[PDB]
Design a protein around this ligand. Structure first.
Ligand code: HEM
Ligand code: HEM
Ligand code: HEM
Ligand code: HEM
Ligand SMILES: CC(C)(Oc1ccc(NC(=O)Nc2cc(Cl)cc(Cl)c2)cc1)C(=O)O
Ligand SMILES: CC(C)(Oc1ccc(NC(=O)Nc2cc(Cl)cc(Cl)c2)cc1)C(=O)O
Ligand SMILES: CC(C)(Oc1ccc(NC(=O)Nc2cc(Cl)cc(Cl)c2)cc1)C(=O)O
Lengths: 145, 141, 145, 141
């Protein structure tokens, strides 16, 4: 439950995001900062150094898709379950991804938004985005069993 | 850190487990999979049903590793070196899951040690499992 | 959400629980196993050893009160939020208790049930009680602000 | 453990903070109180309004403590002894909250250090904050 002030803040900032670029950056930093998450990405090739991770074309390409789904979620803050139901099933049944990883990615995304926007990423705007990333994580986890 | 009293407590409780070690490891695993279904994501190659050979076999491995940690309680980082390598570099289990299994191991011990699972021993076992968990995640990054 | 088999398992076990005794045992064990939780009980006297904590009349009395409220909530598993809303607001606004404490207590209670009931506290019965204690903790946390 | 590379990265990044100690500490605290309101349960005695002098003063103490920890990366347990005692035995802040404040410190650094906050440095800073948090909770039980 974002307040109406929070909802408008999230939307405002997100319009300034290059979703493609930011997606690759967040996924790349996830793999660098928490290197055990590389377990799911053996098909992505070279992830052996920070430079290799950040420069990897598959990381950039996948980051685009991931943050695209995130972006679409922002239009349904009241119904995140509908947006992520199919992806939740995929991440559970096909990909076997521990949903604890979704929290890590959300916090990395918050760090990337802070890095990108600087002072514009104010403490209230961050609080709004923390509610968003927790909501996305919870929705992505909801079909696990 | 584990106090002399902790080490005494752990050695006594784990000593009473004895040959039931494998059984209790499998039971703790089952408890974990049922109570915390996300932990199943680490075992897609397992048949996870009650009684399964893979769960029994893995339960014995976990328990035996714990027995080894108890046998080398003053130097667990060395005693568990190969295991911490394996979890950090290969298995790559998110650290929160160690808390889940640790709790399920405590519950299993409680359910099998009506006499030994005193408040003081409960406290010492929990410290021990958190210590093992810390060692097992010590090489993650 | 508890399934019907789970609800039946929770009710059946709870029928055998001496709530006063189990409450004192669970609160005592919380204070022993996670000593920082003693922070709320400086007026209770000496809590410096397991035996002192466990035999402390104020620990026993408060455990009785806490688990009494928990017990009443088991009659309302489909509305834990409403049931605990007033206590949630109290624990936040007057008592300043970090909700992490409710989660720690819940797991201590599971240990105490396992210890008291042994084999009867089967893996499925545990899973049901894990849902209950998480639900109570989430309900107690819900009015925090 | 902090590698030589981690220590270099932390010292480089934290060196950039400099005279901004009170400011960045107070900002990280505000980020924490707003993002994770349960952390306010440890400060019922504080005026937590925006720009409150009390939060500013406390932010300075937290930041100065971190500056000291950076200076003492090779002997952090000894260097942080008083603070580890204080958090374990008086304040008794639940360990989960250190993860919340660490994240908010990291976000604050990201928001202020555009040039310095590379993926490698982000990784080193996160390791450092976890190590500080580990030391600060090392006496809890
Ligand atoms: C929490 C936010 C996340 C969202 C919105 C998200 C979304 C997506 C999307 C849209 C796809 C492509 C699916 C398709 O094309 O059918 C995907 C695939 C995938 N995701 Fe996620 N994801 C998230 C987090 C994670 C994290 C944290 C991990 C593990 C660290 C992960 C692991 C994977 C893997 C391994 C694939 C398949 C990649 C491949 O094709 O090899 N995801 N995800
Ligand atoms: C008390 C903590 C734990 C200990 C002592 C432990 C010990 C072990 C041992 C002894 C092995 C066999 C190693 C070998 O083959 O050389 C193993 C493997 C494994 N562990 Fe850990 N473990 C612990 C916690 C966990 C956690 C929490 C998880 C994730 C939920 C996990 C997931 C795995 C997996 C997936 C394997 C490989 C299983 C297989 O393919 O047969 N372990 N562990
Ligand atoms: C199942 C979880 C819990 C429930 C249902 C519960 C319930 C209650 C109830 C019914 C009261 C009396 C309130 C009144 O005066 O109207 C109370 C008071 C209190 N609780 Fe909780 N409680 C829980 C967990 C905890 C935990 C884990 C702690 C801290 C470790 C805690 C700390 C306190 C304190 C300090 C008081 C005030 C005691 C006094 O005034 O003597 N509670 N609680
Ligand atoms: C990076 C981790 C942290 C560091 C370096 C740190 C450092 C400090 C310092 C330097 C003080 C002042 C001690 C004095 O008066 O001499 C302090 C006090 C305090 N800290 Fe921590 N702290 C950390 C995390 C936390 C967390 C996570 C919490 C709980 C959310 C917390 C709660 C408190 C409280 C309530 C005080 C007393 C404030 C007062 O009454 O003035 N701290 N801390
Ligand atoms: C500093 C110190 C003593 O703190 C602590 C040690 C252990 C615990 N217990 C838990 O968190 N259990 C726990 C159990 C489950 Cl099932 C799930 C989750 Cl999410 C957590 C809490 C704090 C330490 O880390 O050693
Ligand atoms: C939004 C935020 C900060 O929420 C939270 C972060 C941590 C926790 N703590 C736990 O779960 N403790 C916990 C402790 C025990 Cl003993 C048992 C169990 Cl089952 C869980 C709760 C909520 C997040 O998810 O990042
Ligand atoms: C073994 C190793 C490297 O694992 C880890 C180290 C750090 C993290 N990050 C977090 O949990 N952040 C985190 C951040 C928030 Cl806001 C809330 C919560 Cl609940 C958690 C996760 C695992 C360690 O413990 O040192």
């Amino acid at each position: 439950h974002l307040t109406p002030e929070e909802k408008s803040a999230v939307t405002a900032l997100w319009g300034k995001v290059n979703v493609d670029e930011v997606g690759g950056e967040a996924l790349g930093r996830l793999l660098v900062v928490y290197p055990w998450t590389q377990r799911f990405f053996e098909s992505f090739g070279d992830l052996s150094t920070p430079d290799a991770v950040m420069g990897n074309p598959k990381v950039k390409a996948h980051g685009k898709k991931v943050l695209g789904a995130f972006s679409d979620g922002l239009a349904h803050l009241d119904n995140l379950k509908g947006t992520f139901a199919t992806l939740s099933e995929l991440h559970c049944d096909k990909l076997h991804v521990d949903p604890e990883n979704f929290r890590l990615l959300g916090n990395v995304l918050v760090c990337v938004l802070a890095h990108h926007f600087g002072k514009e990423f104010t403490p209230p705007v961050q609080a709004a985005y923390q509610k968003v990333v927790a909501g996305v994580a919870n929705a992505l986890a909801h079909k696990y069993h | 850190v584990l106090s002399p009293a902790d080490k005494t407590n752990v050695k006594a409780a784990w000593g009473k487990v004895g040959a039931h070690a494998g059984e209790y490891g499998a039971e703790a695993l089952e408890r974990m999979f049922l109570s915390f279904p996300t932990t199943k994501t680490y075992f897609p190659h397992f048949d996870l049903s009650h009684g399964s050979a893979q769960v029994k076999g893995h339960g014995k491995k976990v328990a035996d590793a714990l027995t080894n940690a108890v046998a080398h309680v003053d130097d667990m980082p060395n005693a568990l070196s190969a295991l911490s390598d394996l979890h950090a570099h290969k298995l790559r289990v998110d650290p929160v899951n160690f808390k889940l299994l640790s709790h399920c191991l405590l519950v299993t011990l409680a359910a099998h040690l009506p006499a030994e699972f005193t408040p003081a021993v409960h406290a010492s076992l929990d410290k021990f499992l958190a210590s093992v968990s810390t060692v097992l995640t010590s090489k993650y990054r």
